[PDB]
Amino acid sequence: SLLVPANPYHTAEIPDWLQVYARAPVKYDHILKWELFQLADLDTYQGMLKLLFMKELEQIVKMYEAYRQALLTELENRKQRQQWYA
Amino acid sequence: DVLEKLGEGSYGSVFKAIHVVAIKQDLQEIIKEISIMQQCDSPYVVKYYGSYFLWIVMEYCGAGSVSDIIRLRNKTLIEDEIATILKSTLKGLEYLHFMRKIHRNIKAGNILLNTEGHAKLADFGVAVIGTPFWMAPEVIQEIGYNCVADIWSLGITSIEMAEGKPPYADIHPMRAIFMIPTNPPPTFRKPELWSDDFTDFVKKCLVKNPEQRATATQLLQHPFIKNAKPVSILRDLITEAMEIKAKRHEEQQRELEEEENWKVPQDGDFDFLKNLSLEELQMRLKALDPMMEREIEELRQRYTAKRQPILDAMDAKKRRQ
Ligand SMILES: Nc1ncnc2c1ncn2[C@@H]1O[C@H](COP(=O)(O)OP(=O)(O)NP(=O)(O)O)[C@@H](O)[C@H]1O
Numbered sequence: 001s002l003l004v005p006a007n008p009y010h011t012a013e014i015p016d017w018l019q020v021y022a023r024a025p026v027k028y029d030h031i032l033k034w035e036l037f038q039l040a041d042l043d044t045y046q047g048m049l050k051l052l053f054m055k056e057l058e059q060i061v062k063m064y065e066a067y068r069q070a071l072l073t074e075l076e077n078r079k080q081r082q083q084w085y086a
Numbered sequence: 087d088v089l090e091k092l093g094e095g096s097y098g099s100v101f102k103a104i105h106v107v108a109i110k111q112d113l114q115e116i117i118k119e120i121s122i123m124q125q126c127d128s129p130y131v132v133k134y135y136g137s138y139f140l141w142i143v144m145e146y147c148g149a150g151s152v153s154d155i156i157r158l159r160n161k162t163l164i165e166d167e168i169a170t171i172l173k174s175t176l177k178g179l180e181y182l183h184f185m186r187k188i189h190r191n192i193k194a195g196n197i198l199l200n201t202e203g204h205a206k207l208a209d210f211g212v213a214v215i216g217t218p219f220w221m222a223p224e225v226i227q228e229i230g231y232n233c234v235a236d237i238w239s240l241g242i243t244s245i246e247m248a249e250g251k252p253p254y255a256d257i258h259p260m261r262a263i264f265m266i267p268t269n270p271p272p273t274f275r276k277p278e279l280w281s282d283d284f285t286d287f288v289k290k291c292l293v294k295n296p297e298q299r300a301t302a303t304q305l306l307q308h309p310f311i312k313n314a315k316p317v318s319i320l321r322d323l324i325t326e327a328m329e330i331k332a333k334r335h336e337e338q339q340r341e342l343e344e345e346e347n348w349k350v351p352q353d354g355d356f357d358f359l360k361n362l363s364l365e366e367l368q369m370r371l372k373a374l375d376p377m378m379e380r381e382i383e384e385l386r387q388r389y390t391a392k393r394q395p396i397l398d399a400m401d402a403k404k405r406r407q
């Protein structure tokens with residue numbers, strides 16, 4: 001059978017200048033010319049941007065899942081607080 | 087460069103920019119067209135600078151076109167306002183005809199005003215068939231035509247300023263093509279509202295026969311143009327429009343930073359929910375999803391933008407190989 005390997009970048013450390021390139025503004029984006037890089041080292045960068053987008057998007061969803069539970073928990077307390085009055 | 091929107095309503099978007107300027111959105115012919123649009127030096131004509139190798143760069147006029155001002159205030163223009171604009175419009179139309187050019191467009195939308203109120207012509211070298219409300223009969227019939235083809239359009243335009251729409255506006259355009267050459271000259275829908283000077287000026291502009299149609303220079307000596315007031319009378323309507331334009335920009339960004347307080351509290355601390363009214367708690371739960379897809383969308387739209395120049399570069403290299 002065929003075995004596809006886990007993502008190679010989960011273990012490879014991500015250079016800090018590229019995290020700066022992701023936090024950079026919409027404006028300063030073409031500032032960097034990529035033609036000088038080789039075709040293969042450039043593959044090893046766009047993939048780390050996906051991995052960063054994922055770590056960044058996971059944090060977004062978790063925050064909203066927590067805020068969702070916090071809201072639903074408190075709303076259950078206002079409900080139980082109310083019944084206890086009547 | 088990159089600044090905000092101005093409109094479209096015709097071809098493509100036109101944008102504002104600082105380098106202040108404005109920009110609009112077979113090649114060797116395009117190049118010589120702008121190259122000749124640059125030779126124009128008149129205070130009654132929008133100045134063209136360059137064309138980014140098509141993206142065009144032109145002078146920025148802060149009050150917009152008289153068309154935008156009519157739509158923003160929801161008011162047509164009175165008679166003194168028209169006469170003042172048309173005088174400045176006719177000058178510079180005289181100028182283009184001096185340089186043996188024909189504007190060929192001309193409509194409330196291509197008459198631009200600076201904040202001082204100076205009207206300036208725009209869009210001459212940037213125009214199976216299109217809308218022919220402002221076109222003269224001979225231009226429609228593809229008979230030959232000369233400089234006074236603009237004068238017909240000027241008459242149609244002055245009706246547009248006075249009533250908010252050109253003649254035949256409500257009709258299907260493809261019907262107008264064949265009604266304009268045949269039917270007699272258009273007139274005002276309520277002639278009694280307008281003076282003898284204005285109606286006669288439009289009567290001299292809308293002569294179906296071009297050889298009996300007034301020229302730019304001749305119309306500069308018309309009573310309707312002589313009683314024209316200084317550019318200072320346009321100051322109030324320019325202030326009205328600029329305030330309406332500004333007030334919706336405030337409503338747009340006040341309603342934008344309003345949605346900012348439905349996003350998740352950044353510190354991750356949700357103990358404060360004890361201080362909210364049940365109704366406020368319901369509202370946040372409800373807004374939760376619409377705001378999460380907003381954050382997520384603005385996340386991918388940023389990352390596919392940071393990630394593309396990398397991909398675009400790998401693509402050129404594979405071709406070279
Ligand atoms: N130099 C400029 N300064 C300010 N606003 C401008 C300028 N040029 C164009 N605009 C705006 O652009 C809007 C739309 O222009 P445009 O895309 O040319 O369509 P249009 O003028 O209505 N018809 P057309 O000129 O034939 O393409 C107008 O309503 C103006 O307010």
Ligand SMILES: [Mg+2]
Nearest residue numbers: 195196208209
């Ligand atoms: Mg225009």
